[PDB]
């Protein structure tokens, strides 16, 4: 059997995007975009929940904790997909 | 103002049982604005107070805008207590108490205890 | 513990008295000594920690009824 490290309610593993101006800097400059996830999350569970719900090959998943408690995730997509054409569809 | 906040048994506020519904014609019994009829507008169950139309006059001053313009003076009603009002039928002009008649169907309706008509309004 | 499993003999809280009636505590306890007694239902020695009164039972009454009186044999 292929167990994950922790079973963590995968339709709630992502919470909200970040709409700061530096996030748009990461879109136009990095082909990346910014999500807010819960602390109980992975570079294997978030990375699977982007290539399925969105339909995009994700390059890397750079995560960090934020001292108010919640977790911040810079997800960088592949070169084949612009983050600007996939972020205006959501509302960025 | 902690001396006047709502009491909360099991996180929900204790709501009072009263005798005035919306759309009723109340009379002010004693306090202040004595002896004038009126509809009620908005209801406040925790204070047991009721705001009624076009009688209680509280001329309040409001800073209107954020640009500092026109600063309007708005004349707004306040809360008179629910024990200071009675109900009124427009056929017999007399302020009367309440009563709960159980009619032929299952429903139980209000009743002016001195006259013979029903306070209770249908679905419209 | 300083108890015998067969007969429930424990220590005795019993003061000692000098000539001028001074009393210390002197916890007084039984001679429950190490032995290794033969067992007829297995024809073999068991290693036990027996008080001497319990020794007089297992030689007088036999080890079977004493060990079933305590409840334990293995």
């Amino acid at each position: 059997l292929k167990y994950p490290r922790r079973i963590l309610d995968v339709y709630q593993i992502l919470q909200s995007p970040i709409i700061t101006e530096a996030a748009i800097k990461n879109i136009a400059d990095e082909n990346s975009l910014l999500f807010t996830v819960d602390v109980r999350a992975d570079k294997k569970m978030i990375r699977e929940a982007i290539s399925n719900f969105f339909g995009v090959k994700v390059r890397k998943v750079n995560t960090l904790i934020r001292p108010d408690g919640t977790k911040k995730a810079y997800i960088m997509l592949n070169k084949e997909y612009n983050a600007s054409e996939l972020a205006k569809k959501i509302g960025i | 103002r902690w001396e006047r906040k709502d009491c909360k048994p099991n996180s929900l506020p204790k709501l009072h049982k009263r005798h005035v519904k919306v759309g009723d014609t109340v009379k002010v019994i004693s306090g202040g604005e004595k002896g004038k009829i009126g509809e009620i507008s908005k209801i406040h169950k925790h204070n047991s107070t009721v705001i009624i139309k076009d009688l209680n006059f509280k001329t309040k001053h409001v800073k209107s805008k954020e640009e500092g313009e026109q600063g309007q003076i708005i004349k707004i009603e306040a809360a008179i207590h629910s024990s200071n009002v009675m109900l009124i039928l427009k056929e017999q002009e007399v302020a009367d108490r309440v009563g709960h008649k159980i009619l032929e169907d299952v429903r139980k309706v209000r009743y002016l205890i001195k006259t013979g008509e029903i306070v209770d309004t249908p679905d419209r | 513990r300083r108890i015998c499993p067969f007969t429930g003999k424990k220590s005795n809280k019993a003061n000692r008295v000098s000539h001028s009636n001074h009393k210390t505590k002197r916890l007084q306890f039984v001679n429950l000594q190490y032995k290794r007694v033969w067992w007829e239902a297995g024809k073999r020695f068991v290693k036990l920690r027996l008080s001497t009164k319990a020794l007089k039972t297992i030689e007088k009454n036999g080890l079977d009824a004493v060990a079933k009186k305590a409840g334990i044999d293995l």
Binding site: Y11, P17, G91 | - | -
Partner: protein, 90 residues
């Protein structure tokens, strides 16, 4: 507004509808973050309806007759394999 249809639907379409309403709830989180015009009441009855769905599913766990910890092992034995899928509203 009575939800009479939930005790009519079988367990597979029940569970698939749970996953669809959770996905629509995540779309309501994206539309709430996007500041597009949204209904917060739908954000209420979405999760509030998934509560109804899991009460009916858990009653169906009850009338077979199994333990609470067997429902823990069965439920967590199911939650480990949920491939994410977007809702059919496109």
């Amino acid at each position: 507004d009575e939800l009479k249809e939930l005790r009519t639907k079988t367990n597979e379409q029940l569970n698939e509808e749970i996953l669809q309403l959770k996905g629509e709830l995540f779309m309501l989180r994206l539309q709430r973050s996007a500041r597009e015009n949204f209904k917060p009441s739908d954000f209420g009855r979405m999760r509030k309806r998934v509560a109804r769905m899991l009460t009916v599913k858990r009653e169906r766990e009850i009338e077979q007759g199994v333990g609470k910890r067997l429902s823990r092992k069965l439920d967590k034995a199911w939650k480990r394999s949920i491939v994410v899928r977007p809702p059919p509203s496109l």
